[PDB]
Amino acid sequence: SFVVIIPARYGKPLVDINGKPMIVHVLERARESGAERIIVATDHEDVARAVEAAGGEVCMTRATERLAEVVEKCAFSDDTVIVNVQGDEPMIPATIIRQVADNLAQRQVGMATLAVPIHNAEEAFNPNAVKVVLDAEGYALYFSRATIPWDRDRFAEGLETVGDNFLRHLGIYGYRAGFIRRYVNWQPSPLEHIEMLEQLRVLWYGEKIHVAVAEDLERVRAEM
Amino acid sequence: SFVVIIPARYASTPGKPLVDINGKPMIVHVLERARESGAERIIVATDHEDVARAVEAAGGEVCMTRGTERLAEVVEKCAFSDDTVIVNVQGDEPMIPATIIRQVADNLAQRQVGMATLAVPIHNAEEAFNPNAVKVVLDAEGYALYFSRATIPWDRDRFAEGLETVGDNFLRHLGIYGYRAGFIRRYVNWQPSPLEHIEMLEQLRVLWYGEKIHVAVAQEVPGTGVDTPEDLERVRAEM
Amino acid sequence: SFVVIIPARYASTRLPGKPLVDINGKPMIVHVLERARESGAERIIVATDHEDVARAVEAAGGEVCMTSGTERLAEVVEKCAFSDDTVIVNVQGDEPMIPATIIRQVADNLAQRQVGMATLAVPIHNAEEAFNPNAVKVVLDAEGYALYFSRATIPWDRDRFAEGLETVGDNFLRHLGIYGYRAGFIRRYVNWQPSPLEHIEMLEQLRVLWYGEKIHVAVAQEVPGTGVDTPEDLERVRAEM
Amino acid sequence: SFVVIIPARYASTRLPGKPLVDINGKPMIVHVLERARESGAERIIVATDHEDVARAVEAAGGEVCMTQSGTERLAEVVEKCAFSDDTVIVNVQGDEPMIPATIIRQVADNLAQRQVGMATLAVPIHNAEEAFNPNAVKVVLDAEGYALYFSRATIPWDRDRFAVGDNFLRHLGIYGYRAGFIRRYVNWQPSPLEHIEMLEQLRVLWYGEKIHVAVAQEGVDTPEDLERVRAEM
Numbered sequence: 062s063f064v065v066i067i068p069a070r071y072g073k074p075l076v077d078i079n080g081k082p083m084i085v086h087v088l089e090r091a092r093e094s095g096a097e098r099i100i101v102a103t104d105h106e107d108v109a110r111a112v113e114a115a116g117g118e119v120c121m122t123r124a125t126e127r128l129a130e131v132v133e134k135c136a137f138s139d140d141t142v143i144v145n146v147q148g149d150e151p152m153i154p155a156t157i158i159r160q161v162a163d164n165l166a167q168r169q170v171g172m173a174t175l176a177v178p179i180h181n182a183e184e185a186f187n188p189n190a191v192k193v194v195l196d197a198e199g200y201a202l203y204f205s206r207a208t209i210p211w212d213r214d215r216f217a218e219g220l221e222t223v224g225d226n227f228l229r230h231l232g233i234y235g236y237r238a239g240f241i242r243r244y245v246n247w248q249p250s251p252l253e254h255i256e257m258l259e260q261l262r263v264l265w266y267g268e269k270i271h272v273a274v275a276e277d278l279e280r281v282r283a284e285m
Numbered sequence: 286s287f288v289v290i291i292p293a294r295y296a297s298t299p300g301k302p303l304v305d306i307n308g309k310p311m312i313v314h315v316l317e318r319a320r321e322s323g324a325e326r327i328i329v330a331t332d333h334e335d336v337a338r339a340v341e342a343a344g345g346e347v348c349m350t351r352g353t354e355r356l357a358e359v360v361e362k363c364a365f366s367d368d369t370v371i372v373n374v375q376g377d378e379p380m381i382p383a384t385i386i387r388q389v390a391d392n393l394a395q396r397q398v399g400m401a402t403l404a405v406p407i408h409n410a411e412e413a414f415n416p417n418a419v420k421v422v423l424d425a426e427g428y429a430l431y432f433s434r435a436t437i438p439w440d441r442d443r444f445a446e447g448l449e450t451v452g453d454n455f456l457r458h459l460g461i462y463g464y465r466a467g468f469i470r471r472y473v474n475w476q477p478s479p480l481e482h483i484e485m486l487e488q489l490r491v492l493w494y495g496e497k498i499h500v501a502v503a504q505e506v507p508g509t510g511v512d513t514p515e516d517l518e519r520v521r522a523e524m
Numbered sequence: 525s526f527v528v529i530i531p532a533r534y535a536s537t538r539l540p541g542k543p544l545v546d547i548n549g550k551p552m553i554v555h556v557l558e559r560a561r562e563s564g565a566e567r568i569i570v571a572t573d574h575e576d577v578a579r580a581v582e583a584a585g586g587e588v589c590m591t592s593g594t595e596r597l598a599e600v601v602e603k604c605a606f607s608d609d610t611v612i613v614n615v616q617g618d619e620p621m622i623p624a625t626i627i628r629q630v631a632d633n634l635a636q637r638q639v640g641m642a643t644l645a646v647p648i649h650n651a652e653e654a655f656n657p658n659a660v661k662v663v664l665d666a667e668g669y670a671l672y673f674s675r676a677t678i679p680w681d682r683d684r685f686a687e688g689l690e691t692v693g694d695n696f697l698r699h700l701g702i703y704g705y706r707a708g709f710i711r712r713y714v715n716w717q718p719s720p721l722e723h724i725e726m727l728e729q730l731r732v733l734w735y736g737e738k739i740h741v742a743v744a745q746e747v748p749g750t751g752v753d754t755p756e757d758l759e760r761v762r763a764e765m
Numbered sequence: 766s767f768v769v770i771i772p773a774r775y776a777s778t779r780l781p782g783k784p785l786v787d788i789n790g791k792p793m794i795v796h797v798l799e800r801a802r803e804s805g806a807e808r809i810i811v812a813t814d815h816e817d818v819a820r821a822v823e824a825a826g827g828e829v830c831m832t833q834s835g836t837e838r839l840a841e842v843v844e845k846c847a848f849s850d851d852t853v854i855v856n857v858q859g860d861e862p863m864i865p866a867t868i869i870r871q872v873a874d875n876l877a878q879r880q881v882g883m884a885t886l887a888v889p890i891h892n893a894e895e896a897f898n899p900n901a902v903k904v905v906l907d908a909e910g911y912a913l914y915f916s917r918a919t920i921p922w923d924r925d926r927f928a929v930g931d932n933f934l935r936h937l938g939i940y941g942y943r944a945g946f947i948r949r950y951v952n953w954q955p956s957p958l959e960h961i962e963m964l965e966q967l968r969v970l971w972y973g974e975k976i977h978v979a980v981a982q983e984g985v986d987t988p989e990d991l992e993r994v995r996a997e998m
Contacts, residue, residue: 136609169880203437657928667973695957
């Protein structure tokens with residue numbers, strides 16, 4: 062029992078992939094997941110019409126904090142499990158959306174994300190690839206654009222190679238409507254502005270984040 | 286009430302613990318600092334008997350050992366209560382301001398947490414980008430979120446094109462710790478975490494086992510430790 | 525701002541055409557509509573599948589929605605296309621004397637809590653009711669949220685019942701069937717796969733608790749007279765008004 | 766990773782000196798101490814107010830903490846040891862020497878995995894005797910397995926069939942808590958409901974916290990029991 066809200070800023074939402082707009086592919090993924098309700102949050106009528114054409118529900122928003130807007134308009138109860146799922150991943154498997162919802166429900170954490178192993182040095186050293194370090198229980202310690210965990214010895218010698226310990230954070234956030242409300246009631250944290258990672262506000266205010274281990278010119282076109 | 290344990294290291298590119306600094310060995314200067322802090326008991330952990338005699342002659346206490354396992358052998362040998370707060374202070378810091386030794390003790394005394402430590406602001410970008418300087422990122426209450434040799438937190442916009450300059454938010458972690466005797470035993474009992482060996486950072490084991498570490502900005506910025514002859518003159522001249 | 529929906533069941537073994545039964549000059553359904561107007565509801569909708577009921581209600585200026593209890597409410601929520609944040613209070617058409625004030629209360633309670641549902645309860649003073657499976661007991665947390673609803677006697681007073689079951693304390697609460705919920709919730713509740721607990725106790729509010737949602741419960745501000753399905757109940761009510 | 770505390774209940778109307786009862790060559794509590802060792806606990810403390818039990822436990826290389834609610838007794842051990850708030854404690858009774866070591870570990874895993882305050886266990890009830898027995902605590906879980914309520918009353922109530930079945934869960938007396946949750950627990954004011962049901966865990970539910978209940982279809986107070994256990998071990 063969960064709801065999917067897809068934040069689509071805006072021109073990425075409508076970029077074509079294979080006869081469908083980027084956003085439509087994510088709605089199909091959200092829909093394949095079993096979600097009871099699939100809302101696309103937009104600030105544009107070009108997007109709101111593409112999704113509307115598609116038979117997908119739409120909530121207009123100003124131009125996670127966008128999800129707080131939707132949560133308020135739909136008046137969701139604090140207990141409603143919400144899975145973010147960004148509009149930038151049109152091929153995200155329908156099962157990791159479920160995984161994220163289920164993990165959040167199993168546990169009583171405030172936020173549930175997902176990460177994927179990095180098997181590439183270029184990715185590990187890319188400040189656009191967000192890295193996450195985990196404790197033994199899978200809870201996150203930190204999220205950063207820095208290369209963490211820093212492998213001292215191998216990087217003492219070189220940066221053309223990477224071990225098998227890096228985890229790439231994906232933008233699929235599980236959380237309760239009550240948590241989003243709390244999220245936006247907190248004063249923005251200083252750490253979130255330096256890294257430019259919304260996720261850090263939750264760590265700044267002492268909340269935990271469970272992490273399960275599953276933009277530009279693309280090859281996605283080929284992949285699907 | 287808190288205890289101070291001073292591990293007197295010897296490893297160094299010479300005869301460190303006993304090196305003279307204006308008439309007294311360096312190890313006795315660290316002892317004086319620990320007394321200044323109000324510790325009710327200062328123990329020097331050493332394996333060399335000549336180091337032992339210098340401490341004893343100064344009226345200090347000594348626990349012959351066989352660098353944190355050293356600490357545990359001392360809590361072992363002294364049968365300290367679990368609740369006993371212990372502050373590990375370095376044998377090569379003759380000028381360690383006593384205020385900070387007290388600061389860690391009190392910080393730890395006040396929180397129901399595993400470890401307590403200190404950090405200092407980083408002003409030079411060289412230091413921010415040097416892996417031998419450990420960086421630490423805090424939560425709204427000073428609990429370490431993470432310790433790293435990578436530059437964290439990552440300044441997105443400022444670092445976008447290389448690393449030339451630095452903001453004012455960076456924190457360099459000081460290797461001065463506080464903990465209960467019970468916690469030192471657990472810590473040392475644990476199986477080494479995968480994380481601590483990747484970063485080569487003992488403190489990561491604490492976070493890995495889902496325990497917390499409280500960090501504070503040192504009340505006074507600590508003079509550097511003494512490991513080179515040029516540091517000795519710096520020290521000797523300074524004291 | 526809130527909406528009242530009044531399910532009108534024509535059907536009734538011991539009382540045929542019950543919504544239209546005459547009570548001191550007007551049809552029962554109409555009396556319920558009056559109570560609901562007294563509550564301050566902005567919109568009152570009588571849900572019926574009979575044209576005659578609808579005519580009775582329209583004659584007295586009432587709005588009608590031509591249509592499994594909760595499911596029936598969903599049809600109405602559908603056809604009226606209520607907005608999600610719309611507060612609905614379900615009031616039975618068998619209750620011509622339901623105190624207007626408890627209708628307001630459920631709405632007021634729901635209005636400031638982001639809860640799935642809001643309900644009411646009444647103190648149980650006799651041990652017969654406490655031990656009566658037909659009386660549904662509810663046990664609340666410190667903030668008025670239901671821990672559990674049951675036909676069993678809860679909370680169980682272990683030291684007292686070790687002695688005897690012919691007397692109770694002041695810790696018992698009889699659950700009342702008047703509910704408050706937002707239209708967004710109703711239209712979701714209704715597609716949930718029936719909970720296994722639900723079927724054992726034969727309590728459908730157990731579906732909310734089983735899915736991890738909350739049910740706010742407050743002590744009704746007034747004790748409601750019971751419904752009307754018996755011909756004897758009809759004369760009684762006839763006499764009380 | 767996790768600590769185990771074994772309250773060595775001494776008194777028993779029918780069984781005097783429980784902890785030191787020989788069960789095939791070893792006192793009852795030592796057997797419990799071995800189950801906790803097999804569990805993988807990193808530390809096992811026996812909570813007792815008797816010198817006999819303290820000597821038996823110590824002779825066996827076990828740790829002892831010489832110690833008004835039961836959960837308050839755990840609290841004394843917690844202050845005595847000075848565990849950090851994050852420390853995971855698993856409370857295991859000294860009168861259950863057959864307690865499989867993996868349910869102990871299971872309770873510990875559940876609490877660690879779930880960021881909840883308390884974790885516990887339950888097993889299916891099969892016969893009507895137990896289901897209608899007020900000393901047999903029934904619990905009713907939600908879809909995610911979190912407790913809805915604990916009662917000495919027969920819940921859930923089978924309307925038609927009671928006017929036994931197959932959806933009844935009996936609560937076990939083993940808990941997983943963090944050290945910070947025992948202090949919070951202990952500082953709260955007693956709830957009005959715990960006293961009516963005479964159930965300590967109801968306090969948790971009255972203050973809005975959650976209780977995770979795991980199910981695993983798998984207690985020595987009387988002489989009958991000593992034999993049922995001796996003659997099974």
